[PDB]
């Protein structure tokens, strides 16, 4: 079994900045992470990795 | 993404809020003041023993202002010390001009600063106001910077 | 441009809030129900109240908002809606939420003219939707002359108008002044003989200042500065200010006048050469927000009421806004019970109707029903 | 000057000045809308449950609010009542008491279309028919005058009557419109003479032979900002003493409060509804004074009450009303108070019986007495 | 500019006072309930509970965060991830501020109402314990003020601090203005001394120490009965001086300020009574009795209405605010009378009887008290 992980930053000056529409830059980031998670299970189901075994 | 700048600008403290190191388990042989380098002489029990930089030393770390530890106004023998080993202090010097921009520096006798064009060591990272009729300087500090002589 | 002000300055979003809010906290009664008990049972068990008070406040700042309820009933929401007194649930939107879908026009009807169907889009990530007219309530702000109205999609105009923005701007604008005018009311000047002809940047021009810096931070009463009296002058120069803050109070007037609240309620400062005026001002505000309640937060009453009571004619009473007072009311209670039997001994009013009469009154007696 | 030729109406002066200043607002909005919520009542009714139940079904005070906006400020407006009739919308109304809705429109979408001078009818000079075009892509059509009414601001001249096509003119006349116009430049004067309160002036010999636009004079600008922006109480400037002199000018400022008030008292003046009112200022100088302002303002408000409002309903009652001959009444528009109305009630209930008991004032007349003044005694009907 | 506001709150006492003036007297105000049995067992289990404090600083971190959670667990048999059967039992109650609560589960099934309000929430207090999870009925949600609906949003559904930056530098520049009157009255006089050729005398040296210490002394001794002597041909000692005034009332204008943007007024922010007139601080303390109970009515009360059905027992209940008054023992006594004649005064020839007169005279609150029985 293995274990997987990111990060990503945000500064409190993008917080604090408003955008006219959508949503906002903190929830993308945080949907973003999500989804390279999923992608990379998905990439080790279907294609491997020789140094990992 | 910004490195924030400290304010109070005096001899001995920090400048910056950069990335820095403090070895606080040290003491010391003789009197040092603020500002000035420092120079290993032995290793007692994990403990590192300093005294003020002799012609011939290489240096370590920069002596670090503490309004607790030292109530006189220098730092004593027998006393618990603060140095910095990485990062931008402002340094004593005996120069009259400021050198050029991200030179080498060169310490004469007594931890001070006397040079601007050594091989290897800390730079010169563009701080220069005056104190006392003498002037300070900024330094940055690096941790493996100046190696021992075998 | 308007949201940012209102959530970003607090005099906005006084003059914005301060009416809404305690109108609904006001309170009301209901006529024609056996009783009460239950219905304030309903009333705080559905407990949508500050929601209301949203939806008021949005739409007396953004000049429209739409409130929707879902009734128990199983029909879709699309189609209309059958005679009950059903509801589980109620939310509100702002103004740029709600649109419009088709028309009905057919002259037959009253209703021609008028928006049968409505658009929703909330956002969040769910598909805007389609609501009957009956289910939701629209509810606008100030009034607009026609040619306006219908250039705004039918829909009000924002408290907050030019006007009143650049009065509230001007505030900070004299504010600030008045801090430079208290840092420059007083300079000193220090002249040297050849001081021009000084280098810059040079070691020199740096100890200059450093000693100027350290002189004149060692000036004061208790200390003197020795200057060459060949080469050197040290002299001083200052300014009176007067009337500043009648100039503020006058601005602040300004303000007041324009907003239509008066001043201990926005300045909230009691006069203080007066001990039972304020009352009176208070009175007067009372009347305005009564003036105003009369003509929007009604039809939030009928368009709410008949879908919780299944009773057939019923009334809406406004409680009459006036702080009330133990002692005061005692007394009003010695009075108005002696008033309602002193003389009702002798005709053919009876008890089944002064009971009546008694707990219709308000009063601290409680009492069991029966005869 | 030209205009948009789709706005090109009297609308985009007045009704500019309606939408954007708020002072304006008020003057227009205050008097109509409170003096249609005053409310009124009815006598001559076998009960008057059932008929504020209908006045609310029917709902259409907000729209009688804004047809009196609208009469007021445009100088005239027109509504127009449907009433469940089996009839084309032309002919004129058979007696009956019903109602399917009403709605007002302004002064621009109504025309006269048909003119009666008829020597027999008394009713020569006035359109008999109306055009009404509201627009909204649908056609322009007639209405007879019997089921309209038409509302006006205020009286002028006749011979402004007749070029005004029997309308009447704007509250907001040239002279109130102007008095409110030069105060904005009166606080604009007030605010450029608080920032001018204090120069500073910096003299350099031979500054005047620095070359434009370049470096040089860049930087001597750059100086001059932050030395300007470093000085204050606490720190102090030096200067050359041969080639440069900095100075300080001052100057006075007083009056310009009361300055201001004097104005507001001529806008006052000129509106005609008072302080209390208008700047919504209390005197704070007295206790009980600002009460007698206030009713001195119901007796002018019920006064051009009414001559405006009554017309409203004797046109709009009896269209509603089963009962043959009835009279209306208004309420003495006074904010009662608890207390107040406790005692007064103590009064009525003890002149109602303390001597009737001696005449032949009987209780099925004494009852009618004592509940026809509106009490909280809530009394069932009966004997 | 502005800074996090836990920076102000311990550091500056205006905004503790600002933040904590209204919650503290709002809870600690109390409430009466109705359609109980008794009331004195009810107030037993109030006071042994204890639980007001924790309430307080609920309200308070609610208030300046722009929102807080309180978690409250039941003497219950199961899990407390899962919902929560009827019942009238709890043992404690804790809040935790904005911080450490976060959405985990979202639900929005069509036919419940509860579609947009999270099922479960994630809760990370920290102090080396574990986060864990909470079901939605066992948690209460109160936010700060009302704010427009993109910041609503945009803040994941949290309101705003009550110190708007607005606020923030207006009190801000309060202090500048006392330092700056501070320098004002240290800058009243100055005296200035000229002694020709004192240029020439070069720096840090015996003479120029000499010059100065002798300064010293001869400044030291100066005042009404003494007196100074200087060289005519050589030097001259002037003084100068400069006035102030309007000082008091201009800082008195920056406090109006900041009472009109807070909107508590001087008796309470101030705490200097105007003295002019004798009973006109009634009429200010009744105005903000009015508009501390409008802010009341809107966050205290959904508090309760979440915490009682954990802690009675019977069904049907109903809350009443007292009228928020400090009352007068001789008015009490007063008020007593009249209202204890009124209730017995003309009872005698109507249906009303003593078993309802009673409890008509315990509806008030009286100081008489007596056994219940007939």
Same mark, same amino acid.
């Given at each position: ?53 | ?150 | ?181 208290? =840092? =420059? ?187």
């Amino acid at each position: 079994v293995f274990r997987l992980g990111n990060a990503y930053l945000i500064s409190i000056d993008e917080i604090k900045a408003g955008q006219a529409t959508g949503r906002p830059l903190s929830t993308r980031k945080a949907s973003a992470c999500q989804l390279a998670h999923d992608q990379l299970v998905n990439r080790l189901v279907f294609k491997g990795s020789a140094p990992h075994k | 993404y910004e490195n924030l700048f400290l304010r109070p600008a005096c001899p001995g403290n920090i400048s910056d809020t950069s990335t820095y190191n403090i070895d606080g388990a040290c003491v010391a042989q003789g009197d040092i003041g603020f500002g000035s380098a420092v120079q290993v002489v032995g290793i007692v029990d994990g403990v590192k023993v300093v005294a003020a930089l002799p012609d011939g030393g290489t240096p370590y770390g920069i002596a670090f202002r503490s309004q607790y530890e030292h109530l006189s106004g220098k730092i004593l023998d027998g006393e618990v010390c603060n140095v910095v080993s990485h990062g931008r202090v402002w340094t004593l010097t005996s120069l009259g001009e400021a050198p050029s921009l991200f030179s080498k520096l060169q310490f004469g006798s007594g931890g001070v600063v006397t040079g601007g064009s050594g091989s290897a060591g800390w730079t010169f990272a563009g701080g220069f106001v005056k104190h006392e009729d003498g002037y300070i300087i900024e330094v940055q500090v690096k941790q493996n910077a100046f190696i021992a002589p075998p | 441009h308007v949201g940012s002000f209102y959530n970003d300055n607090a005099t906005a979003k006084r003059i914005v809030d301060v009416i809404p809010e305690e109108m609904v906290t006001a309170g009301f009664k209901i006529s024609g129900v056996k009783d009460e008990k239950e219905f304030k049972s309903l009333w705080d068990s559905y407990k949508i109240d500050p929601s209301l008070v949203d939806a008021l406040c949005w739409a007396r700042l953004y000049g429209g908002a739409a409130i929707v309820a879902i009734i128990n009933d199983n029909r879709m929401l699309t189609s209309p809606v059958k005679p009950g007194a059903k509801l589980e649930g109620v939310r509100v939107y702002d103004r740029f939420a709600i649109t419009i879908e088709k028309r009905v026009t057919n002259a037959r009807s009253p209703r021609y003219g008028e928006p049968e169907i409505y658009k929703v889009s909330p956002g969040d990530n769910i598909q805007p939707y389609l609501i009957h007219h009956t289910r939701i309530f629209i509810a606008d702000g100030e009034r607009v002359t026609p040619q306006m109205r219908k250039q705004n999609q039918g829909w009000g105009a924002s408290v907050l108008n030019k006007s009143l923005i650049d009065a509230i701007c001007d505030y900070d604008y004299c504010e600030s002044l008045a801090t430079q005018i208290l =840092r =420059r009311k007083q300079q000193a000047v220090w002249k040297v003989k050849g001081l021009a002809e000084m280098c810059d940047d040079d070691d020199a021009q740096y100890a200059a200042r450093l000693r100027l810096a350290q002189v004149d931070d060692n000036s004061g009463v208790g200390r003197a500065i020795g200057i060459d009296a060949e080469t050197e002058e040290y002299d001083v120069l200052n300014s009176d200010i007067s009337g500043v803050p009648e100039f503020l109070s006058s601005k602040m007037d300004r303000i007041v006048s324009l907003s239509g609240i008066h001043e201990i309620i926005i300045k909230n400062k009691n006069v203080g050469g007066v001990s039972a005026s304020q009352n009176t001002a208070l009175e007067t505000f009372y009347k305005l927000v009564d003036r105003k309640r009369e003509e929007d937060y009604r039809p939030l009453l009928e368009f709410l009421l008949p879908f919780i009571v299944d009773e057939q004619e019923w009334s809406i009473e406004f409680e009459p806004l006036s702080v009330p007072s133990k002692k005061e009311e005692s007394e009003i209670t010695k009075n108005n019970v002696e008033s309602v039997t002193k003389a009702i001994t002798e005709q053919i009013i009876d008890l089944e109707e002064a009971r009546d009469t008694l707990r219709s009154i308000a009063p601290e007696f409680k009492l069991k029903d029966g005869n």
